[PDB]
Amino acid sequence: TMDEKYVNSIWDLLKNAIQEIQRKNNSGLSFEELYRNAYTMVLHKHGEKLYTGLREVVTEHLINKVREDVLNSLNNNFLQTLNQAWNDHQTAMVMIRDILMYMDRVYVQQNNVENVYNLGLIIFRDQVVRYGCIRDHLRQTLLDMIARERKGEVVDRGAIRNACQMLMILGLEGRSVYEEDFEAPFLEMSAEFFQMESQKFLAENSASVYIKKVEARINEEIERVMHCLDKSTEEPIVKVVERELISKHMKTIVEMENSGLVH
């Protein structure tokens, strides 16, 4: 049985189509064409070649342009650029996995290897999120305007929402990249900011209005965690307030000159 003649050209055709869809071009391509392509190149038992080609093509597609497209933004906020790049990556990745399900049902089980989706998301994590220059610039922008909102400003909260969302979805099973990138530094900065805020608020206002202000700060933390932080991040940050303003300055609350619990 001879089938290699069209396989030789279909290598190039499918690789070109993969690159074209990866750069967000879908109006001209034929979904059925990519289906039949990948299917015939797979049932001929060329799984390892297609797997290696997909790995390399995705890795260099992310390295060559997407990383630079994220980096080159200076007159626009970093978060929106990274969000657009990640959205385009997801749009390409869903399509690619829809193509390569036949390889995802036969070859992977026999060879005990990774699937398309997890592998490509891992490549994105290692070449975009884990890559240092994007990581530190992202953390800088996030901390910057999260601190402006903390001290009180009107910001683009949806940008931080998309950022945090890609952060803890690109980690898949774990929160590892999200917890190591910005979440723990944010918790530390919140702890320090609330230490200084409690210190200044205690010596400035009476205990009753201080209680009202701290409960309003809890309400604002809830507002932010619905609007500017991740929903699953509700419980840490809130108690970060609770540990810093109340649970460690009990004697300051109970005793004051002309005020306090005794008064």
Binding site: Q109, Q110, N111, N112
Partner: protein, 339 residues
């Protein structure tokens, strides 16, 4: 190329493993001692002659009741001999010839075989009609099944070609637990009495000890220079003897991560095709590519005895689960039971 630094770290870790092993390396109490239980010259007589195969006995595995031994022949048929009466409890034909693994379940309710067919056949021996029927055909191995063992009566381990040691849930038929990490062809496999760690001996001279739950290689042992023919855990589930195509058998210890003691002699050059421990573990019975096989004193590194009652290689060796007698599946179409 960042592979250079990864290789450097791996090399340094391997070196550290070597120094750690050399650190615990000291005088071997068994080697130095010669006055504690010198087993002397032990002789065994053929008590049973299970003639009735017409082809080479390729593999042979005892039963957990130490009465029923399943012997697979080269032509392809499993004879479940009753050892006492030399009677064929079953003589089931094989779907495909060239079978090299015969795995007997502890219950004796299932039997497993596999061959140059890349399919692991599981026959349910016990059924209402009594007709031995195939229970499940495990497919999903692109390499030939090298060895198989029953981790349970619905859970099996199938050391195959393609370096896969895939674990299967039998009745589902799916590869519930996947195993990979060997480089040489996985050609032998053994279970500890604990049955929680399985050792895989490949053609890369490596015995990889695999943590059976998480699908990850607990330990790695490498003392041989040739493909490992067979492995046999100590009766303690903490160490295993290992025979390879070289004339050197090696007792690897899990606690020390190093060869406890070697077993070699300038009168043996043939590969050790099978290794087996007595119930005590004091005697290490080894089947050789030499038509006759031998047995070392497992803690004195000397030949306790020699079993020479064949004409072809002892392709498989197995001592009774109660350690009472030993069966010698050989390529001369016979099995000898020695007591």
């Amino acid at each position: 190329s960042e592979l250079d630094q990864l290789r450097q770290e791996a090399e340094q870790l391997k070196n550290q493993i070597r120094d750690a092993r050399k650190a615990c390396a000291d005088a071997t109490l068994s080697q130095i001692t010669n006055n504690i239980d010198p087993v002397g010259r032990i002789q065994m007589r053929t008590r049973r002659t299970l003639r009735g195969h017409l082809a080479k006995i390729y593999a042979m595995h005892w039963g957990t009741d130490s009465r029923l031994l399943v012997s697979a022949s080269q032509d392809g048929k499993l004879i479940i001999w009753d050892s006492y009466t030399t009677n064929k409890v079953h003589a089931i034909p094989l779907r495909s010839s060239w079978v090299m693994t015969c795995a007997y379940a502890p219950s004796g309710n299932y039997v497993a075989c596999g061959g140059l067919d890349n399919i692991c056949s599981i026959y349910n021996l016990k059924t209402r009609e009594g007709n031995v029927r195939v229970s499940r055909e495990l497919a999903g191995h692109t390499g030939y099944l090298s060895c198989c063992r029953f981790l349970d009566d619905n859970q099996i381990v199938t050391s195959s070609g393609d370096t896969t040691c895939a674990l299967w849930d039998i009745e589902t038929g799916q590869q519930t637990t996947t195993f990979t990490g060997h480089t040489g062809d996985v050609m032998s496999l053994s279970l500890a009495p604990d049955t929680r760690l399985f050792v895989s001996g490949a053609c890369d001279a490596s015995a990889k000890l695999w943590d059976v739950r998480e699908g990850m290689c607990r330990q790695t042992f490498t003392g041989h220079e040739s493909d490992i023919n067979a492995i046999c855990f100590f009766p303690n589930g903490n160490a295993f003897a290992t025979g390879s195509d070289d004339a050197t058998c090696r007792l690897f210890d899990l606690r020390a991560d190093q060869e406890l003691m070697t077993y070699s002699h300038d009168n043996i050059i043939c590969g050790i095709t099978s290794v087996s421990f007595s119930k005590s573990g004091r005697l290490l019975l080894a089947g050789y590519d030499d038509f006759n096989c031998n047995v070392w004193d497992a803690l004195k590194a000397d030949r306790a005895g020699v079993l020479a009652g064949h004409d072809n290689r002892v392709s498989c060796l197995g001592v009774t689960d109660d350690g009472m007698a030993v069966a010698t599946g050989s390529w001369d179409s016979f099995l000898k039971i020695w007591n």
